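Minutes, structural biology subgroup

Action item carried over from last meeting: produce the structure token record for Major allergen Cor a 1.0401 (Corylus avellana). EB confirmed the sequence was re-checked against the source entry. Recorded below for completeness.
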Amino acid sequence: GVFCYEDEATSVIPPARLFKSFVLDADNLIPKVAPQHFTSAENLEGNGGPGTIKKITFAEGNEFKYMKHKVEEIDHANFKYCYSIIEGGPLGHTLEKISYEIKMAAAPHGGGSILKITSKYHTKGNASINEEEIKAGKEKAAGLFKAVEAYLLAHPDAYC
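Output recorded by EB:
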């Protein structure tokens, strides 16, 4: 089954900075912002736009594997980034893909942003929403939006 999760939250930053940190500099920023679950990244093969595989290096406790993060549509004009995961630790037994859709919208907050991450989980036809793996995916995605709300609260300017 595809399950469809979202975390919509409010940031100190205009969404240009919030998309440009979370998604565009995901390669170093996410692995500095939940540094316990992600260690580093590399742009594996891609044109910078969609059809790009990023390789985000990935952990539980210690470093585990490379995970492969597939860019499917970027939109800095609406501060969106849609992506996918063809291979990875979560993909590993029970999932055939995961998607993410970022949209970053305007907020009622002064100078701020609505961040969204979506994540969907395409559970292999042998497997559910892994109560183990999808409860991790939803809590680790919250990890980043909260830790980025703090880190981008301290470097609002960096991604300008």
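Discussion: Residues 36 and 82 are 24 Å apart (CA to CA).
Next step: EB to file the record with the rest of the batch.
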